[PDB]
C-alpha cells in the first residue's frame, strides 16, 4: 500500500483540583514539558516539531499531536501510537514543572456535555480527481464506516441527554453534508485543500468525521479501508451510486443503533444496513485490486482487504466476538458487564466514567491500556517499535529529512514545517530556508548518506545548495 497520509489528534485535557488552571496553560505545559524546534508559521502558542517528524502543539484549548507523513496504514498506526506515548510522557514531565499540576489526557472526542474535539485523517490525492466524485462516493462510506471505526459513547444527542449507547462519539456533532467548518455545523466532507505540496499535482483530503481510536486494529482499518476507497475514486472505478437519503440523519441513526440493524435508504431504491453497505465497498475494492494488480498485489493491501472482510462478517454474525479488535465493542463489553453485575441503567455515572477513562493515556489507569496489559486486546505493532517511533521518523517520506536534521543539527534549526526546514548557521545574518516541497522526496534513499557524512549544519547546507531539485523536488 502506498499513499501519503497522516493523523492529527486533539487530546482531552483535565486538571482536577487546580481552580486556577486554564486549558490553554495546561495544554502549553504538556507541549513545553516534553519539548525542540519551533514551528514555522511563515499569539503563537507552544508549537514544536519533534525528532520523529511529528508536530506537537496547542490548538486553542487542547494539546494536539500530528504524525509525520507516512505512506501506509501500518506506519500511520505506529507513529500515531507513538503520539499517545509522547502525550503520556509529556503530562508526567509537566507534573515536575514548578506549578506541579497533575494533568490527565484523553484520546477521545467529547466531554458528553456538548463539546467535541477532533481526530483528523489526511490523505494525499491527485489534483485531477473531480471533487463531485470524492463527495458522492465518500459520503456513504463515511456514514457507515463507524461500524468498525466507532469508539463508542454513552449518551445520545450532542448534549448527552438521551439515554443509551451509540457507536461513535462524533456522529451527533455532524450537521451538513459538505463544507469548510471544523468546529460547528460540521460537514461529513470537509472541503479545505491545503496540501503543503505542489497544488498543481496534489490535493490534501482533510477528513474530520472519525473518532480517535485506541485499538490499533481500528486505526489500521480506518486509514487502510479509506485509502482503498480513495484509490477507486481516483481511478473512476465505482460505477454504482451508493448515495443515501438524508445522509446526516443516516449517520446519526447508524450510530444510535448498536444492534447494527438500521437500514439506510439508497437513492437507487435499495435498503441496506451499514454493514451491508460496507460489504459493497469491500467487494468493489476486491475487484479493483484484482483488476489492477492481479498477482502484483502487495501483502499490506491483501491484509487490509482480509481484515476488512473478516470484521464485516463478524459484525453481521455477532459483534461481541470483536471485543479484542474494535473500541466500541471492547468498551461495550465492559459497560454491559457492569450493567449486568450491578443492574445499572444507561444513565448511571459509573457508565459515563468507563466511557471516558477508556481513553486515558496513563498505562496504569486507562482502561484500554489495562485491557492490553492483561492480554485482552489484539495489537498490530509491538511496543519496542512504538518507542523507537517516538524519536525516529519514517524512512520513506520527507519527514526523514525533517526529523533527522532536528536530531543531528537541532541547535542550528531556527524552525521547521511540513514544507521547509530553516537553518540558522554560525556567522550568517540571514536564515537558510531549505524547501521540502515533495512529500516523497527528502527520504532516507535521497538524503540519508549525505546526512551521515555531514558533520555540521553548515556542511549540510553547503552540500544542498543548488541541489534542491535533486534532493527535495
Amino acid at each position: 500500500m502506498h499513499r501519503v497520509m497522516g493523523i492529527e489528534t486533539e487530546y482531552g485535557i483535565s486538571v482536577p483540583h487546580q481552580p486556577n488552571a486554564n486549558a490553554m496553560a495546561a495544554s502549553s505545559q504538556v507541549v513545553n514539558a516534553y519539548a525542540q524546534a519551533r514551528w514555522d508559521f511563515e499569539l503563537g502558542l507552544a508549537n514544536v516539531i519533534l525528532t520523529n517528524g511529528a508536530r506537537l502543539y496547542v490548538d486553542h484549548a487542547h494539546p494536539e499531536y500530528s504524525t509525520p507523513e507516512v505512506t501506509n496504514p501500518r506506519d500511520a498506526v505506529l507513529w500515531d501510537k507513538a503520539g499517545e506515548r509522547i502525550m503520556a510522557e509529556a503530562a508526567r514531565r509537566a507534573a515536575d514543572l514548578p506549578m506541579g499540576w497533575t494533568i490527565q489526557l484523553y484520546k477521545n472526542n467529547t466531554d458528553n456535555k456538548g463539546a467535541s474535539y477532533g481526530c483528523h485523517e489526511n490523505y494525499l490525492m491527485n489534483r485531477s480527481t473531480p471533487f463531485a466524485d470524492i463527495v458522492r462516493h465518500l459520503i456513504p462510506f463515511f456514514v457507515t464506516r463507524q461500524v468498525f471505526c466507532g469508539a463508542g459513547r454513552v449518551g445520545i444527542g450532542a448534549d448527552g441527554r438521551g439515554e443509551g449507547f451509540q457507536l461513535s462519539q462524533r456522529a451527533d456533532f455532524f450537521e451538513v453534508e459538505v463544507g469548510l467548518e471544523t468546529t460547528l455545523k460540521r460537514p461529513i466532507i470537509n472541503t479545505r485543500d491545503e496540501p503543503h505540496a505542489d497544488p498543481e499535482k496534489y490535493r490534501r483530503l482533510h477528513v474530520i468525521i472519525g473518532d480517535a481510536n485506541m485499538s490499533e486494529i481500528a486505526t489500521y482499518l480506518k486509514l487502510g479501508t479509506t485509502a482503498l476507497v480513495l484509490a477507486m475514486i481516483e481511478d473512476g472505478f465505482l460505477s454504482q451510486d451508493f448515495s443515501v437519503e438524508s445522509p446526516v440523519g443516516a449517520l446519526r441513526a447508524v450510530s444510535h443503533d448498536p444492534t447494527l440493524r438500521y437500514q439506510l435508504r439508497l437513492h437507487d431504491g435499495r435498503r441496506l444496513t451499514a454493514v451491508q453497505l460496507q460489504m459493497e465497498y469491500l467487494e468493489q475494492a476486491r475487484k479493483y485490486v484484482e483488476d489492477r494488480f492481479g498477482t502484483d498485489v502487495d501483502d499490506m493491501t491483501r491484509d487490509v482487504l482480509d481484515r476488512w472482510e473478516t470484521t464485516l462478517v463478524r459484525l453481521a454474525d455477532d459483534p461481541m466476538q470483536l471485543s479484542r479488535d474494535l473500541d466500541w465493542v471492547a468498551k461495550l463489553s465492559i459497560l454491559e458487564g457492569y450493567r449486568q453485575r450491578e443492574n445499572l441503567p444507561w444513565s448511571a455515572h459509573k457508565l459515563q466514567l468507563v466511557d471516558l477513562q477508556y481513553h486515558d493515556v496513563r498505562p496504569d489507569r486507562g482502561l484500554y491500556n489495562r485491557l492490553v496489559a492483561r492480554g485482552r486486546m489484539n495489537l498490530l505493532v509491538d511496543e519496542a517499535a512504538v518507542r523507537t517511533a517516538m524519536h525516529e521518523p519514517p524512512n520513506d517520506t520527507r519527514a526523514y529529512f525533517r526529523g533527522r536534521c532536528l536530531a543531528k543539527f537541532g541547535a542550528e534549526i531556527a524552525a521547521a514545517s511540513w514544507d521547509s526546514v530553516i537553518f540558522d548557521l554560525p556567522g550568517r545574518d540571514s536564515l537558510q530556508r531549505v524547501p521540502t516541497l515533495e512529500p516523497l522526496r527528502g527520504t532516507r534513499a535521497h538524503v540519508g548518506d549525505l546526512l551521515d557524512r555531514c558533520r555540521s549544519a553548515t556542511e549540510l547546507v553547503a552540500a544542498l545548495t543548488g541541489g534542491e531539485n535533486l534532493y527535495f523536488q
Binding site: 482536577p16 466531554d111 458528553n112 463539546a115 460547528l184 453485575r341
Partner: peptide, 28 residues
C-alpha cells in the same frame, strides 16, 4: 468476571464528581 475486577481497581475515585467535572472546550 476477572477483568471487571481489574477495571474496578483502577477507576477514578468519586465517579459522579469526576464525570460532572469533565468539561472540555470545543475543538475541531
Amino acid at each position: 468476571d476477572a477483568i471487571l475486577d481489574e477495571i474496578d481497581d483502577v477507576l477514578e475515585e468519586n465517579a459522579e464528581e469526576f464525570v460532572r467535572s469533565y468539561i472540555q472546550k470545543g475543538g475541531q
